[PDB]
Design a protein around this ligand. Structure first.
Ligand SMILES: CCCCCCCCCCO[C@@H]1O[C@H](CO)[C@@H](O[C@H]2O[C@H](CO)[C@@H](O)[C@H](O)[C@H]2O)[C@@H](O)[C@H]1O
Ligand SMILES: CCCCCCCCCCO[C@@H]1O[C@H](CO)[C@@H](O[C@H]2O[C@H](CO)[C@@H](O)[C@H](O)[C@H]2O)[C@H](O)[C@H]1O
Ligand SMILES: CCCCCCCCCCO[C@@H]1O[C@H](CO)[C@@H](O[C@H]2O[C@H](CO)[C@@H](O)[C@H](O)[C@H]2O)[C@H](O)[C@H]1O
Ligand SMILES: CCCCCCCCCCO[C@@H]1O[C@H](CO)[C@@H](O[C@H]2O[C@H](CO)[C@@H](O)[C@H](O)[C@H]2O)[C@H](O)[C@H]1O
Ligand SMILES: CCCCCCCCCCO[C@@H]1O[C@H](CO)[C@@H](O[C@H]2O[C@H](CO)[C@@H](O)[C@H](O)[C@H]2O)[C@H](O)[C@H]1O
Ligand SMILES: CCCCCCCCCCO[C@@H]1O[C@H](CO)[C@@H](O[C@H]2O[C@H](CO)[C@@H](O)[C@H](O)[C@H]2O)[C@H](O)[C@H]1O
Ligand SMILES: CCCCCCCCCCO[C@@H]1O[C@H](CO)[C@@H](O[C@H]2O[C@H](CO)[C@@H](O)[C@H](O)[C@H]2O)[C@H](O)[C@H]1O
Ligand SMILES: CCCCCCCCCCO[C@@H]1O[C@H](CO)[C@@H](O[C@H]2O[C@H](CO)[C@@H](O)[C@H](O)[C@H]2O)[C@H](O)[C@H]1O
Ligand SMILES: CCCCCCCCCCO[C@@H]1O[C@H](CO)[C@@H](O[C@H]2O[C@H](CO)[C@@H](O)[C@H](O)[C@H]2O)[C@H](O)[C@H]1O
Ligand SMILES: CCCCCCCCCCO[C@@H]1O[C@H](CO)[C@@H](O[C@H]2O[C@H](CO)[C@@H](O)[C@H](O)[C@H]2O)[C@H](O)[C@H]1O
Ligand SMILES: CCCCCCCCCCO[C@@H]1O[C@H](CO)[C@@H](O[C@H]2O[C@H](CO)[C@@H](O)[C@H](O)[C@H]2O)[C@H](O)[C@H]1O
Ligand SMILES: CCCCCCCCCCO[C@@H]1O[C@H](CO)[C@@H](O[C@H]2O[C@H](CO)[C@@H](O)[C@H](O)[C@H]2O)[C@H](O)[C@H]1O
Ligand code: NA
Ligand code: NA
Ligand code: NA
Ligand code: NA
Ligand code: NA
Ligand code: NA
Ligand code: NA
Ligand code: NA
Ligand code: NA
Ligand code: NA
Ligand code: NA
Lengths: 89, 89, 89, 89, 89, 89, 89, 89, 89, 89, 89
């Protein structure tokens, strides 16, 4: 096996691996969508409390967002800063 | 391995990886759909407050949209600005 | 490898990638169905607000449709404007 | 590679991608079923508004169906108007 | 590659695509079951409105069934009216 | 490729295709479960209407069952009346 | 190829297919679990009607169990009454 | 093909098939957890009806466990009472 | 085929099969989490009955845990007490 | 087959198998999230009961976590104490 | 097999396995989002309790986050501190 073959296989697997990691993004999309609906209902029933409600929404959603970011970071690593390449040469 | 074989395998894996990443889009669809439903419900109870209600809906949905955008970017990178090619030669 | 073999595998992987991307469309189907169901319910309780109900539904459903559109775009690119072909040689 | 081998792989992959795409159909199935159930409970509680309830059900369901149509079209294309065949010769 | 090999591979990928397509059938199973649940509950509360209740259920369920039917059509095509064969010559 | 190799591959893919299709059975499993629960609650609340409730449960569950049967038929066809065999021999 | 090879591949694919088919069992597990929860709640609110409530629960679960059985029959066929073997040698 | 090769492939496939079957166990876990939750809620409100609330819970959970057992049996057969080795020779 | 190759393939397949089986663990995670949720609001509303509430939760969750254990067992067997090795070959 | 080839393949399958096992962690995330939401709702209603609410939350969440831990243990075993290598040499 | 091929195939499998592990992150995303929605709703209805409402959310979400963190750790190990390399040469 030459070096070109080594990179080809590893980067190819890296591409598939990156795609698989990104699937996790469906979760925050669902969970934050729920926090959004609750906010819509809450500002409707109690308009004078709007600012407090939005802050609580953004705070809650930001936390729910993290595992989305984890997947993104993993993907970007496999794409732009692949740790495997240095192990071949 | 010749270069043409190397690129073929990598770009092919990139196509599959891109499709997998896009699956995440199901999440925001569900989540934002929920936010839509609550707006519908809230507008019926308080038709005069519509403006503030959709305003809150859009803000929430926008945040719920992000992980969909992350996947789209990753896919578009793999298709149009593939980072693996330069590593192959 | 010759050119015909290159395109063949890249296009083949592109077809699968397109199919995978379109799976995301299940999301909006669920989410918008939820908005639809809330519209039905709302029209039944406040029938006088039917016009405001329907227009809120459409708008919210339009927003939740977006990631379904993203996937469709990715799939059509892969099928009709494949950006891998011109990278092979 | 000869034309037949090139056609074989491209069409074989096209068959899998089309099947993958059709998986999206479960979404509208769930979402529309929800709208249907809300319609049932509503014409019972409010039999005076049956016309506008069923009218609202159909419209909301139709919008919810669109991504199912998207995937069906992609499948139909891969099946009957395959765009990869022309890239082969 | 000879014609028998061509047909073998293409048909094999078709059997798999068909199975994948049929997966979508889980959606309508969930949605229509929900519509049935509301119908059961509605018949109990308004025993005399059973006619309109059930009629509403069937109509809504029929709509929800459609994408399960699309998948069944795609599968039957791949099995009994395969469009790929006439391309191999 | 000889006849035996052809039949082996296409039948092998057919077994996998049948199993994939059978995955759709989870849907009616869930949906009909929901209708069952609503029946348990409703019969306990409205004993005078038991027969009308159970009858409503069965009809609704039967409609929900349909896509499960579709899958079962496709699986049965692939297993006992395989339509690919006459295209290979 | 020889007989042993033909049978090996087919029986091998049949193992995976049987496994895939069994995945559908998750549905009835969810659906019936839901019916059980409703039974519990009904019994709590009306302890004297425990026998009647249970009876309704078992009936509704029997119906929900059906597609799990379908998947089980398909898997048992592939393992014990494999219809592909007579198609080979 | 020699006998060892035949045994290796089928058992290899059998191992994968067994794991796929076990995936189904997730359903019963969800459904029974729901029943468990209803028991917890019911025991608190009607503590006089405990035991009767518990026994109903166990019964319902027992029923919901069935498809999980089916998958266990299939997995146990593939691992210990493999019905394919008998066909190899 | 030699015995080292035979064991390599069978164990490799066994590793994947163990991973697949463990996926089932998500179900009990969802179900028991629900039971925990009901327990929390019950002890809030009915502080005196805390002993009975925690007791029902543990029992109910124990039941829901079983299929998770079934999968853990299958996995452990595949890893430490592999029943395939002694049939090679 | 040489030893290095044997180890390569079995470890390669172990990496994939471990990744599959970790997928189960999505369950506890959903489940424990639900428990957390019930705690929030409960602390809002009985702010003074916060301490006992947290205790119950932590308990049930701990139970719900178990199958996540199982999956993790299975993965760490495959990575750090692989039970297959000894069978190969 | 030489060292380069061994490293290559293992790292390649490690990338995929890393991606599979990251899928679990969707769970916490859903779960934490749910807790977020409850906070949004609670904070509105009970302004005097915002402090304990928010703190309870953060705590519960943190517990819900753990299995995502586990998957992240596994992925980071496979990418940056690969345990299989040490066993090849
Ligand atoms: C998930 C989707 C996966 C899709 C995978 C598609 C894989 C396509 C592989 C192509 O590799 C070629 O197919 C050729 C044609 O049938 C072979 O003979 C071709 O190559 C030969 C040398 O190996 C000689 O005939 C000449 O070089 C050339 O004809 C060639 O097998 C092998 O190189
Ligand atoms: C999840 C995604 C998984 C993706 C897996 C993709 C696997 C792609 C395999 C491509 O096959 C390789 O092609 C090289 C180029 O043809 C061969 O080396 C060549 O140069 C080598 C070094 O000289 C020579 O030995 C020969 O030409 C041949 O062996 C090499 O052996 C062969 O394996
Ligand atoms: C943080 C986000 C940053 C986004 C940055 C986007 C930058 C895009 C630069 C162009 O991207 C790719 O670079 C490859 C490498 O230059 C090009 O392949 C070209 O060069 C390769 C060799 O380097 C060859 O193998 C290819 O065949 C040849 O097309 C490829 O076409 C091009 O799309
Ligand atoms: C999920 C996505 C999966 C994507 C998988 C893609 C797999 C690609 C496998 C390619 O296999 C190699 O293809 C080369 C052709 O591309 C062959 O070259 C040969 O035939 C070539 C021409 O086709 C000739 O140039 C020579 O024989 C040598 O160069 C080589 O033997 C063959 O092993
Ligand atoms: C969605 C799933 C799609 C799956 C598509 C699968 C397509 C498979 C195409 C196989 O094509 C054949 O592959 C052989 C290899 O298998 C080639 O010969 C090659 O086999 C070797 C490949 O290097 C040569 O070196 C040897 O001489 C030769 O017999 C042969 O020419 C080629 O036509
Ligand atoms: C989910 C989808 C799964 C799809 C699986 C598809 C599997 C395809 C397997 C490989 O096909 C090989 O194809 C060669 C193609 O050429 C044949 O070649 C043979 O007949 C060839 C000519 O057709 C001859 O050159 C020789 O027998 C050898 O080269 C023969 O079938 C076999 O070696
Ligand atoms: C979910 C999808 C699962 C897909 C599984 C696909 C499995 C494909 C197995 C292919 O098996 C090979 O086929 C070749 C076909 O050619 C055989 O060639 C032999 O018999 C051939 C003719 O059929 C002869 O030419 C020679 O023995 C050699 O060329 C060879 O023995 C056989 O092992
Ligand atoms: C769901 C999983 C399904 C898995 C199915 C796996 C099927 C494997 C069939 C293997 O049959 C063997 O295949 C070899 C090739 O791999 C043949 O190689 C032998 O023949 C070859 C092809 O002609 C070349 O290696 C040289 O010619 C010769 O080694 C060999 O005779 C043939 O018996
Ligand atoms: C999810 C399922 C995964 C399945 C993975 C495993 C698939 C099958 C792998 C290969 O098994 C092959 O069987 C051939 C026989 O059919 C062997 O032939 C050899 O021994 C043969 C005779 O037994 C000889 O002819 C030669 O060594 C060559 O032809 C060959 O070495 C061996 O590798
Ligand atoms: C999740 C499923 C993963 C499945 C992974 C399967 C990986 C491939 C397994 C089979 O590999 C073959 O084994 C043969 C031995 O059985 C080797 O024989 C060789 O050494 C043999 C004798 O030991 C010789 O006869 C020849 O080199 C050829 O016949 C052959 O080269 C090698 O390719
Ligand atoms: C869950 C993911 C699991 C991924 C598992 C990936 C396993 C990859 C195994 C690759 O094994 C190699 O395959 C070569 C063939 O492609 C063999 O070539 C040999 O036998 C070949 C024919 O089978 C011969 O041509 C020569 O011995 C050489 O070319 C070689 O020995 C064998 O080590
Ligand atoms: C998701 C997981 C995906 C895993 C994909 C793994 C793909 C592995 C392809 C391996 O191809 C084999 O090993 C070497 C690659 O170059 C080549 O043999 C050659 O190279 C070896 C490594 O240098 C030597 O040991 C052999 O002697 C020599 O014939 C062999 O022909 C080639 O088929
Ligand atoms: Na998070
Ligand atoms: Na987001
Ligand atoms: Na959107
Ligand atoms: Na739509
Ligand atoms: Na429809
Ligand atoms: Na139906
Ligand atoms: Na049924
Ligand atoms: Na059952
Ligand atoms: Na259980
Ligand atoms: Na647990
Ligand atoms: Na946790």
């Amino acid at each position: 096996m030459d070096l070109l073959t080594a990179k080809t296989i590893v980067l190819g697997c890296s591409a598939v691996g990156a795609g698989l990691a990104m699937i996790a993004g469906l979760g925050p999309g669902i969970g934050e969508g729920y926090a959004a609906g609750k906010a819509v209902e809450s500002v409707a029933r109690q308009p004078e409390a709007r600012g407090s409600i939005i802050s609580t929404m953004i705070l809650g959603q930001a936390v729910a967002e993290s595992t989305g970011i984890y997947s993104l970071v993993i993907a970007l690593i496999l794409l732009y800063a692949n740790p495997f390449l240095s192990k071949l040469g």
